[PDB]
Each structure stands twice: as structure tokens, then as C-alpha cells.
Coordinates of C-alpha atoms in Angstrom, one line a residue:
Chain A
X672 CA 0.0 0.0 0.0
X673 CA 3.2 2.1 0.3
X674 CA 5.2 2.5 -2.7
X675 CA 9.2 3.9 -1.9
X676 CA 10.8 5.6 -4.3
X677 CA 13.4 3.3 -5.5
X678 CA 13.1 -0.4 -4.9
X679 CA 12.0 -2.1 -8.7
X680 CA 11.0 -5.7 -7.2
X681 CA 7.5 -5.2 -5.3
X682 CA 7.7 -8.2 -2.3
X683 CA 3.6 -9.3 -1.9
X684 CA 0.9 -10.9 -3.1
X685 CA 1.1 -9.4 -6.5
X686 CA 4.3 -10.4 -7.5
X687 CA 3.1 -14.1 -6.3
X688 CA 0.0 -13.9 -8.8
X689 CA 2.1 -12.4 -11.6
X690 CA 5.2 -14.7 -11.2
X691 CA 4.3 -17.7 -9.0
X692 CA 0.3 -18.1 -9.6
X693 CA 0.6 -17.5 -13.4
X694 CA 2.9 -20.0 -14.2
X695 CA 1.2 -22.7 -12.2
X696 CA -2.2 -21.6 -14.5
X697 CA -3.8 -21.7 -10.7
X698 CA -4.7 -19.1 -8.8
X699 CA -5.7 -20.1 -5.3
X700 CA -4.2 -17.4 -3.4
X701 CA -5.5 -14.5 -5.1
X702 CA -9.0 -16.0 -4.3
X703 CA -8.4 -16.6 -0.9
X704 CA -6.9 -12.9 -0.5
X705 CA -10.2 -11.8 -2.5
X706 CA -12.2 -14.0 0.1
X707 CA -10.1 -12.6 3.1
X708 CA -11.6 -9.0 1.5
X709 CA -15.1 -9.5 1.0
X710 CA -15.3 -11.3 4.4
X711 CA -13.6 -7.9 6.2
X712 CA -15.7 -5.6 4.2
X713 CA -19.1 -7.2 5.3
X714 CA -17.7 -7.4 9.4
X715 CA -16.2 -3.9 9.1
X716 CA -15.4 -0.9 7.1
X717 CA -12.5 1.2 8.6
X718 CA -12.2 4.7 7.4
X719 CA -8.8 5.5 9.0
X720 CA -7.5 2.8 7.2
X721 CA -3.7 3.6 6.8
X722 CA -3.5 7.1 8.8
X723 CA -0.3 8.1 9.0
X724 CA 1.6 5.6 6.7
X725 CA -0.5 7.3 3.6
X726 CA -3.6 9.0 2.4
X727 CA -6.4 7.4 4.7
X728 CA -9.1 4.8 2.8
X729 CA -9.3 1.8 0.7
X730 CA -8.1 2.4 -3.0
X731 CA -4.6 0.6 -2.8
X732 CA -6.4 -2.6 -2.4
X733 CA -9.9 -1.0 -5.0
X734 CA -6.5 -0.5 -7.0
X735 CA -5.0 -4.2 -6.8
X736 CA -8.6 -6.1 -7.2
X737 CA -9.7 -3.5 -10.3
X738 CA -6.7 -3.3 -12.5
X739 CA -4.3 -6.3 -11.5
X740 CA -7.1 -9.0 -10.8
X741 CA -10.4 -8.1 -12.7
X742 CA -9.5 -6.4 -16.0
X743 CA -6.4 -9.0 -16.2
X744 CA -8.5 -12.0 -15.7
X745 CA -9.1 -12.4 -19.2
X746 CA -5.6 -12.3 -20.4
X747 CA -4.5 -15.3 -17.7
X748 CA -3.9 -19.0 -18.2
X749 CA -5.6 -21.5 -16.7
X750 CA -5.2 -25.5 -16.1
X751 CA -8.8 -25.8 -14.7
X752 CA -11.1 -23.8 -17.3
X753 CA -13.6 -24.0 -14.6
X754 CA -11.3 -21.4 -11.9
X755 CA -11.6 -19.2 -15.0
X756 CA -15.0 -18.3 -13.4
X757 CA -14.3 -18.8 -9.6
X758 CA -11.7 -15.3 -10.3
X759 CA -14.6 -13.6 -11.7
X760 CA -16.8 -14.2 -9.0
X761 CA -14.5 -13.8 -6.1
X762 CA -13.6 -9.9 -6.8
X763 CA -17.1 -9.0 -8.4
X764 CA -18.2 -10.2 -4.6
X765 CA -16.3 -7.8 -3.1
X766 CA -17.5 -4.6 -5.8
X767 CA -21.2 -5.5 -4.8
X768 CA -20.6 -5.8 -1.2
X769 CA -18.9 -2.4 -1.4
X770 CA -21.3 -0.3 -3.6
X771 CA -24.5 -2.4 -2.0
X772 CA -23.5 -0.5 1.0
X773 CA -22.2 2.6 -0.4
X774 CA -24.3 5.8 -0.1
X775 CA -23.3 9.1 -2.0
X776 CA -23.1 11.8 0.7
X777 CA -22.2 15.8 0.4
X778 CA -18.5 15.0 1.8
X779 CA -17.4 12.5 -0.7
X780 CA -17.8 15.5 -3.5
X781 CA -15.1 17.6 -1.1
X782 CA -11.4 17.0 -1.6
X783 CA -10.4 16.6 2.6
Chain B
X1 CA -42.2 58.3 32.0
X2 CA -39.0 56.1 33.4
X3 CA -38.4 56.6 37.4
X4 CA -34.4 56.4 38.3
X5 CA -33.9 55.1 41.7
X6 CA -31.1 55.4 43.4
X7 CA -29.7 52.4 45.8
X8 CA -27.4 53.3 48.6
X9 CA -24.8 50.3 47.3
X10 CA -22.5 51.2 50.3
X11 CA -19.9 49.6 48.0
X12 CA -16.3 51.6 49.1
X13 CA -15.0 51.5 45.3
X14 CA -16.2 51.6 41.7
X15 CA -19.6 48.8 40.7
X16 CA -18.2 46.8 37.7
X17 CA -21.5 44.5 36.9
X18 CA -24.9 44.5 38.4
X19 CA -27.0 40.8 37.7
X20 CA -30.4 40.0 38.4
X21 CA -31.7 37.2 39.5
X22 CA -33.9 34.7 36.9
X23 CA -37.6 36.2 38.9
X24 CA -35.8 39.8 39.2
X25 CA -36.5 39.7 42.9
X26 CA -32.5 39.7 43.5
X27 CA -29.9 41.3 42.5
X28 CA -26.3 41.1 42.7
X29 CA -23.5 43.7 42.6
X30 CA -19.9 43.1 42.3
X31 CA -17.0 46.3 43.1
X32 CA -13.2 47.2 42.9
X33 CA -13.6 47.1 47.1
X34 CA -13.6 43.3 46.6
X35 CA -16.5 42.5 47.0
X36 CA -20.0 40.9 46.0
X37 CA -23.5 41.9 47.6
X38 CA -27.0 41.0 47.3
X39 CA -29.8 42.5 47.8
X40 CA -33.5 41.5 47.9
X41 CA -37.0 43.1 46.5
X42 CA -38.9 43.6 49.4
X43 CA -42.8 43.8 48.7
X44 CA -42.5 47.5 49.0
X45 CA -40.8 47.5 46.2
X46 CA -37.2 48.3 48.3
X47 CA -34.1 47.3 47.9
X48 CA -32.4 45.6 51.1
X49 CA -28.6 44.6 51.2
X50 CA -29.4 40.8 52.5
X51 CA -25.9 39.8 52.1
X52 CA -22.4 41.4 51.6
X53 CA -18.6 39.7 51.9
X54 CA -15.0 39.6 50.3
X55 CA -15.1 37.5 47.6
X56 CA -11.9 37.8 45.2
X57 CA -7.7 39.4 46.3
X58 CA -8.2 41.9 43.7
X59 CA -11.4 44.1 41.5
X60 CA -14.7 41.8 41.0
X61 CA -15.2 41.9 36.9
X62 CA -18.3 40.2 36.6
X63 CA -21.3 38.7 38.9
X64 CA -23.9 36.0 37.2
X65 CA -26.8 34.2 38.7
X66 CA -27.3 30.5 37.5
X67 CA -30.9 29.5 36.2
X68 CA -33.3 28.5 39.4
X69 CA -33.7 25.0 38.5
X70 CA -29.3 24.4 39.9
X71 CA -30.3 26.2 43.2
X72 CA -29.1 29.9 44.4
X73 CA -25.8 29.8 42.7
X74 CA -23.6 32.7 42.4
X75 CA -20.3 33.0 40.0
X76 CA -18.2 35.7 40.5
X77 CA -14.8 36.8 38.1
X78 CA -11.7 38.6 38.7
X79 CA -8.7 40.5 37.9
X80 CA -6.9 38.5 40.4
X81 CA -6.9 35.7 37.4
X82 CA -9.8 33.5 39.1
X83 CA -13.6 32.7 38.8
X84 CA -15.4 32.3 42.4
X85 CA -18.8 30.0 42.7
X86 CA -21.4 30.2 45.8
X87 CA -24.4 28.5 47.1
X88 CA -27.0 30.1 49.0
X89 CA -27.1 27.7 52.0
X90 CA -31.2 28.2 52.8
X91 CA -31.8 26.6 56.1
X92 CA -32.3 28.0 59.5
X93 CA -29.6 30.1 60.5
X94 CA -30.8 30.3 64.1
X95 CA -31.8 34.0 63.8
X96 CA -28.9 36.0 65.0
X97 CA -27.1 35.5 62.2
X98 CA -29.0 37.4 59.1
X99 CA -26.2 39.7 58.7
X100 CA -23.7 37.5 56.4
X101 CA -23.1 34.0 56.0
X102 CA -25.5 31.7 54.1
X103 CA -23.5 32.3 51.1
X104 CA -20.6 29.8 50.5
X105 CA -17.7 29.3 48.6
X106 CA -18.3 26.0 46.4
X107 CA -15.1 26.7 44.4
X108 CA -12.3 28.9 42.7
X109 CA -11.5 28.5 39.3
X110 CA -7.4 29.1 39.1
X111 CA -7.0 28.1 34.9
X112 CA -6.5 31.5 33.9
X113 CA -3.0 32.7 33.6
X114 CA -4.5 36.6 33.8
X115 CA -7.5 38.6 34.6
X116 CA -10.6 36.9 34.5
X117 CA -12.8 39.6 32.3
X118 CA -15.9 37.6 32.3
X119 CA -17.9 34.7 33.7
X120 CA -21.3 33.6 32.3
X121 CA -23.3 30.5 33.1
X122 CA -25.1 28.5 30.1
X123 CA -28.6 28.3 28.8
X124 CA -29.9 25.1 31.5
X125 CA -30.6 22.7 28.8
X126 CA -26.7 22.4 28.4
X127 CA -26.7 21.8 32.0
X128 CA -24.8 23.3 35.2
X129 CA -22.1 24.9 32.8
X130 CA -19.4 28.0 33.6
X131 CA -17.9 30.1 30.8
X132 CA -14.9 32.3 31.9
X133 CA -13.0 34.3 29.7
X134 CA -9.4 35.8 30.1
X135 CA -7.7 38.8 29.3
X136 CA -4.9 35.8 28.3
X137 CA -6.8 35.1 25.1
X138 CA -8.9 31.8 26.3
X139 CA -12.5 31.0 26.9
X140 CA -12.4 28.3 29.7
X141 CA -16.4 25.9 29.9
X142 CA -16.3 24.2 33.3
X143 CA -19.5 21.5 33.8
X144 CA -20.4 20.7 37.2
X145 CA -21.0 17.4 37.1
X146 CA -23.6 17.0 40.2
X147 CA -25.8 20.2 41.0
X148 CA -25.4 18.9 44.6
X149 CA -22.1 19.1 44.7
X150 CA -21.1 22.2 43.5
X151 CA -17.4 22.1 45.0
X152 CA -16.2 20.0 41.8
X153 CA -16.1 21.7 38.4
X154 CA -14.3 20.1 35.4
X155 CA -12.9 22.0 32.9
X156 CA -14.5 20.7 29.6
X157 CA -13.3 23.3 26.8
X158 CA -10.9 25.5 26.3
X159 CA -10.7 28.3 23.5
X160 CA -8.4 29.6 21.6
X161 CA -9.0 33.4 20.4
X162 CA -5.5 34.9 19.9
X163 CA -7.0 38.5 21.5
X164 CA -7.4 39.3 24.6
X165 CA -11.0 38.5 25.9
X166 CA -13.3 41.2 27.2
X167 CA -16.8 40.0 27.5
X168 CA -18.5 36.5 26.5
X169 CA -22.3 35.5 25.4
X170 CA -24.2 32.3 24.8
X171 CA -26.2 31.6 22.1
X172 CA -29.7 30.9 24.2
X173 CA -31.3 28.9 21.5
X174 CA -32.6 25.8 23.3
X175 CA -33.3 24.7 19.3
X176 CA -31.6 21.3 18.9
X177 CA -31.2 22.7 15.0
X178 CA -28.6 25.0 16.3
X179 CA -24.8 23.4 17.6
X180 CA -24.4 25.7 21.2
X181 CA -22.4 28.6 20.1
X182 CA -20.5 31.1 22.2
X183 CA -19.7 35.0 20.6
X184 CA -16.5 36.3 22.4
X185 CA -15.7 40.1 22.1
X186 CA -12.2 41.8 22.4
X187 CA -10.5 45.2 24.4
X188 CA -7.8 45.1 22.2
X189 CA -6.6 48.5 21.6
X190 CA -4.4 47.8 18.4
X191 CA -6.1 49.3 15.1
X192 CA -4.3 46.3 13.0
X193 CA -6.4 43.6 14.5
X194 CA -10.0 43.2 12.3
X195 CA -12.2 41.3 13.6
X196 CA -12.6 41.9 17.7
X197 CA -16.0 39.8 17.7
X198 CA -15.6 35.9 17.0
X199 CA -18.4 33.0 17.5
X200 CA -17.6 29.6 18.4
X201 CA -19.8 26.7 17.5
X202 CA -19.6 23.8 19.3
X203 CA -18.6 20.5 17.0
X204 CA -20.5 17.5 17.9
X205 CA -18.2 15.7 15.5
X206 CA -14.8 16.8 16.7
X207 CA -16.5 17.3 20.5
X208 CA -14.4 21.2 20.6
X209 CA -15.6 24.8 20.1
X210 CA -14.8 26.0 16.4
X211 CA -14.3 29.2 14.8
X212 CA -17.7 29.5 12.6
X213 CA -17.2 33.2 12.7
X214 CA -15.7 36.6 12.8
X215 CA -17.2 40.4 12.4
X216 CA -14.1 41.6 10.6
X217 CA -16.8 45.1 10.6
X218 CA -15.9 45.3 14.3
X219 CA -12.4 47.0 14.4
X220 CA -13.1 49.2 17.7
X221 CA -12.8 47.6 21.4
X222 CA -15.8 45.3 22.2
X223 CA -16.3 46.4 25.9
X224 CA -19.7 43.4 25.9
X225 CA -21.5 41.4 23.5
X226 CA -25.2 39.8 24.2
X227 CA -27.2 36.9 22.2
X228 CA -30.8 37.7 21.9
X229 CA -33.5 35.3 23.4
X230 CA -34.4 32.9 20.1
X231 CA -38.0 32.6 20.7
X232 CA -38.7 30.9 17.7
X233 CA -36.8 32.9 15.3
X234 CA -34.6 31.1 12.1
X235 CA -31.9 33.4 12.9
X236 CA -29.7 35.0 15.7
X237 CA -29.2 38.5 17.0
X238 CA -26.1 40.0 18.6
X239 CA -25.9 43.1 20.4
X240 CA -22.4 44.4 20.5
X241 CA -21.3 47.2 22.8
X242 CA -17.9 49.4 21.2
X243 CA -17.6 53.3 20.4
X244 CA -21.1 52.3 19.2
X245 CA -24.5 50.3 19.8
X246 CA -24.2 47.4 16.5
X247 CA -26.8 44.9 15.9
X248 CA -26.1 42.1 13.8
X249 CA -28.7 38.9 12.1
X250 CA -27.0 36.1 11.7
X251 CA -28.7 33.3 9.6
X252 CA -27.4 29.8 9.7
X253 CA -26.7 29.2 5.6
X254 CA -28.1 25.5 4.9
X255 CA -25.3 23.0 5.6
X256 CA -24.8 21.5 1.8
X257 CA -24.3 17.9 2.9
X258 CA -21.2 17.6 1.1
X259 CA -19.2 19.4 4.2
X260 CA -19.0 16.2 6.2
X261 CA -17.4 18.3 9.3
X262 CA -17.8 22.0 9.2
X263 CA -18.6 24.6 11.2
X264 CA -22.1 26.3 10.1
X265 CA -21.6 29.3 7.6
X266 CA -23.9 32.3 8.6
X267 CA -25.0 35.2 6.4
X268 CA -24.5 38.3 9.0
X269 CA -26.0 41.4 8.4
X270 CA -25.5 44.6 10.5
X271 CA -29.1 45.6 10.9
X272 CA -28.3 48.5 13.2
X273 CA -25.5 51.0 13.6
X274 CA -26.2 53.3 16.7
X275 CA -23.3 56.4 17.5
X276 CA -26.1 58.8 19.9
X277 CA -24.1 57.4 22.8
X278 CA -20.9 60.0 21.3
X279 CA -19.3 57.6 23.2
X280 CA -17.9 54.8 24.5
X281 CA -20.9 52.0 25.0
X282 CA -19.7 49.5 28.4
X283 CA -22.9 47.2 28.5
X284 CA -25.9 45.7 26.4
X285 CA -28.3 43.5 27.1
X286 CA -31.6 42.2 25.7
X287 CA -35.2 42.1 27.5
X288 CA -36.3 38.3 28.0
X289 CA -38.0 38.6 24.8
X290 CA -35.2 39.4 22.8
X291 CA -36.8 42.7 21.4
X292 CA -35.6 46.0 23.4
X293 CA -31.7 46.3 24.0
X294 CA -30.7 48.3 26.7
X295 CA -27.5 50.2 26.3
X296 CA -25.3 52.3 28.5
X297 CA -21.9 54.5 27.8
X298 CA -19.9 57.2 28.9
X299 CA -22.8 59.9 28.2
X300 CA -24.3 58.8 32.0
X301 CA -27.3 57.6 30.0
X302 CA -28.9 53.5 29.4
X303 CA -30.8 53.8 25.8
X304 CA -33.9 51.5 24.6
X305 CA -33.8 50.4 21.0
X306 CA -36.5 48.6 19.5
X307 CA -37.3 47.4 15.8
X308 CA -40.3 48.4 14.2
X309 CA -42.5 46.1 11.9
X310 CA -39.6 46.9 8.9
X311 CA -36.7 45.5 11.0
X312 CA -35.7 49.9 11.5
X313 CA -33.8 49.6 14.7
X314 CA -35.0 53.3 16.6
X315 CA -34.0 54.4 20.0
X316 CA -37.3 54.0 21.8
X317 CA -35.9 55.7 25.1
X318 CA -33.2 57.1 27.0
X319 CA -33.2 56.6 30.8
X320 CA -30.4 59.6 32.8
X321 CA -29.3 59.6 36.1
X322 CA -30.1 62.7 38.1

């Protein structure tokens, strides 16, 4: 969630999906981690999330499971054609959970 | 046709403040001798001196009553850098006694690093609450936790204003539409400073006093500063006492909800300008209405203004001393 200026090689879950996960064509820990998020989203919402280590809130991890997961689950190999599917559903979980919830209020049209 | 009349005070220095009590059957006066005295109404319509002692090592600023429903509470401030609270002990002093001593000294309030310009109680439906200001620049809210207990006092807020304080006012409105606000008026003598009258809005969100507002109109001293009653008004009236009478409307502008935080914005208006003092104005303060303001300056004279049908402010009366 905190990105140094200067270290090239990223240590985390998506270097494991993009270089471990992808060349096994299975991608078990990217839907447990998806799992792990739509199961802390429905028990709690923080909205300090990250104060004073960056900009407080969620879109790091909106970030990971929108560009690196969803729009790149196309584009991915896969020894069971049926986990295919199981990707899909696993983050599109977590984007209903989060705008099923989700009501636009004055504040969030103010840059804080 | 007005009738002055005069009150032996038998105070042996200058009268700073004069407060009466919630039924107007009391009143309180508070001197440079030290000192705080009460007297009572009698059915005569006299005035009797009922009690009278030392209450403060240096000039008494201020003297408030609290509201009836927290007892017979007195709060007294200081240039000696301290706010003083009493009770009113009413019990059978076996009668030998009635010269002096049923008031008591619940507490002294010691916060403030200088004099102690004023000391206001809140509207009751914020419960047993003490502003104080400071000549030091803060506004200090102690709470007394239990009414029957009046020897503890917590200090709840403290204020910021970056002047020196001269007079304090709560906002009255018991209207749970309105956050409790506090108007705070400056002495400062310095002709670079704008802006000697600032309101503070309480924050439910943040639980402290904000900045909502400052009269950057008000340049001269503010010598004191009184909220209207809000009987069921949509906006708020301040009386401010400088080289002139001003009366300002301020209207709480609709909190667009995209301000998840902020203090309310208020469109102010100065509805009246008054200079027929040609002087220096020391006190205002409204009827229980919140119609007539009473004024009184340097010219020896208190002045009634009242608005007419049109909101145009007039001076309805002026009330000398012989």
C-alpha cells in the first residue's frame, strides 16, 4: 500500500499472482486474498485505514482487485477452465458488497 | 415616563457588573472594594442589602446568577486571574445571624494565567455549565458534574481566540437545529487587528468549540456582546457594545451535505448601527424577549432600542441619572 521511491521488485501478493500463480495456471491465493476482502468488508469498514503511513481509505487494495485481478483475468492462463469463473466471482463479490452498501453523501464531492 | 432610583450600594470602590436574578426579585453587585453583595426586593418594592462579603484578592469583573432550576448559585470573576462560585445555604440560620453568611464558597476556578474579564453561566438545557474568559486570550467551559455538589467543576473546553478576551455571550437557542455557540468580544486596543468579535460553534463531531465566525466590521474595542433570546426565530441576534450600539442577524446558511465536518456558515447582516451614545458603550443586554436592547456609555445615560414592523432599529428611550 506504500510505494518507496526506489526499490523495482515489489515483495507481496502481486508479485506471487504475476510470477508464481501465473505460471502454475492456478490461482488459489489470489482467491483466498479476494475472500479474506469480502469477508472484512461485510464485518467492518475502517475509514482511517492507513492514517499516517498514507492518504487514509481503501483504493490501494480498489487499485489491486480492479486493474491487477479483474481487468487481467481475461488475459491469464488456466489448467482448470472452470477457476476461469471462480476469479470472476470472487472480486465482483467484493465490488457489490462495497457499492451495495455505499451511499453518495455531500462530503465525498469535497477534496479533505 | 421612566423613574431612576437610586440604591445606597454602600460599596467603598467603583460597581463593575450589576446581575439579576432569573424572577428579578434579587440582585447582585460586584466592586473594585472586593467585593459581592446582594440584595432582595422587598414587597414595597425596596431594595435591602441581605448579604455582603470579600469574595476575590483583587477588583470583581463580573457577577452571574445560574438558572433556578441548579439552586441559588452565584459565579463571580476577577482581575486577580480567578472565577469564584457560591451557594446560597437556605436553612435555619438560628436567627442571630442574618447579617452575612449563608452564602458559600463552592469553588475557585485558578486556569487562567491573567484577569478573569468575564464569567457567564449557560442556557440550563446544556446543564450546570461556567464560561470564563481571560484577558490571556482563552474561553475556559467548566461543567459541574452534580448540581449537589457544587465544590467540583471540570474543565471541559478550552478556546483559543488569539485576543485578549473582554466580554462572553451564549447563544440561548434551546433549538436542537442550532450546535451551542458562544460570541466572544475583544478590548484590544491595536487598530491592525480586524475582527474583535468571534463565534464559536460547538462541534458535535470533533466534541471542541470552532471558529464558525468573525465580524471583521468590528475594528473598535468590544467592551460586551449579548445573544438575543431565540423565541422561535430562524436566525440570531447580537448586540455588541464598542464606540457604538451594533446589531447584527446572523442566519445559519443550509449545511450542503457535502461538508462532512464543518462549522455552520452564517449570512450576518448589520441591521443596526447606533453612535447617539458619542461615546464609548460599556454594556448591552436584551429584554427576556429578545426585542428592546438596553445600552449604556460614557454619556451617563442607558438607551432602549427597539425594531419596528420593517426591522428599522430606533431608540425608543433614554433613561439619565439625576
Amino acid at each position: 500500500t506504500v510505494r518507496a521511491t526506489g526499490l523495482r521488485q515489489g515483495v507481496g501478493i502481486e508479485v506471487e499472482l504475476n510470477e508464481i500463480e501465473s505460471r502454475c495456471e492456478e490461482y488459489p491465493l489470489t482467491r483466498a486474498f479476494c475472500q479474506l476482502i469480502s469477508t472484512l468488508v461485510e464485518s467492518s469498514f475502517p475509514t482511517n485505514l492507513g492514517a499516517g503511513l498514507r492518504a487514509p481509505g481503501f483504493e490501494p487494495y480498489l487499485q489491486f482487485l480492479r486493474d491487477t485481478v479483474f481487468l487481467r483475468y481475461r488475459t491469464r492462463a488456466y489448467r482448470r477452465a472452470a477457476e476461469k469463473w471462480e476469479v470472476a466471482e470472487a472480486v465482483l463479490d467484493v465490488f457489490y458488497k462495497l457499492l451495495k452498501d455505499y451511499e453518495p453523501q455531500p462530503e465525498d464531492f469535497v477534496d479533505q | 415616563m421612566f423613574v431612576a432610583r437610586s440604591i445606597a450600594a454602600d460599596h467603598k470602590d467603583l460597581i463593575h457588573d450589576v446581575s439579576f436574578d432569573f424572577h428579578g426579585r434579587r440582585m447582585a453587585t460586584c466592586s473594585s472594594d472586593q467585593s459581592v453583595k446582594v440584595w432582595d426586593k422587598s414587597e414595597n418594592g425596596n431594595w435591602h442589602c441581605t448579604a455582603s462579603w470579600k469574595t476575590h484578592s483583587g477588583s470583581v469583573w463580573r457577577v452571574t446568577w445560574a438558572h433556578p432550576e441548579f439552586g441559588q448559585v452565584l459565579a463571580s470573576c476577577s482581575f486577580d486571574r480567578t472565577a469564584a462560585v457560591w451557594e446560597e445555604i437556605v436553612g435555619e440560620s438560628n436567627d442571630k445571624l442574618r447579617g452575612q453568611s449563608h452564602w458559600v464558597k463552592r469553588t475557585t476556578l485558578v486556569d487562567s494565567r491573567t484577569s478573569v474579564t468575564d464569567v457567564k453561566f449557560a442556557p440550563k438545557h446544556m446543564g450546570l455549565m461556567l464560561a470564563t474568559c481571560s484577558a490571556d486570550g482563552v474561553v475556559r467551559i467548566y461543567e459541574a458534574p452534580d448540581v449537589m455538589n457544587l465544590s467540583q467543576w471540570s474543565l471541559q473546553h478550552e478556546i483559543s481566540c488569539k485576543l485578549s478576551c473582554s466580554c462572553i455571550s451564549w447563544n440561548p437557542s434551546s433549538s436542537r437545529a442550532h450546535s451551542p455557540m458562544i460570541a466572544v468580544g475583544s478590548d484590544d486596543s491595536s487598530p491592525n487587528i480586524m475582527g474583535k468579535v468571534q463565534i464559536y460553534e460547538y462541534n458535535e463531531n470533533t466534541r471542541k468549540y470552532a471558529k464558525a465566525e468573525t465580524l471583521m466590521s468590528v475594528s473598535d474595542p468590544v467592551h460586551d456582546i449579548a445573544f438575543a433570546p431565540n423565541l422561535g426565530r430562524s436566525f440570531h441576534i447580537l448586540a455588541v457594545a464598542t464606540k457604538d450600539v451594533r446589531i447584527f442577524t446572523m442566519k445559519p446558511l443550509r449545511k450542503e451535505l457535502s461538508s462532512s465536518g464543518g462549522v455552520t456558515k452564517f449570512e450576518i447582516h448589520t441591521v443596526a448601527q447606533f453612535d447617539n451614545h458619542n461615546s464609548q458603550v460599556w454594556r448591552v443586554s436584551w429584554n427576556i424577549t429578545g426585542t428592546v436592547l438596553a445600552s449604556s456609555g460614557d454619556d451617563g445615560t442607558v438607551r432602549l432600542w427597539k425594531a419596528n414592523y420593517m426591522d428599522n432599529w430606533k431608540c425608543i428611550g433614554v433613561l439619565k441619572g439625576d
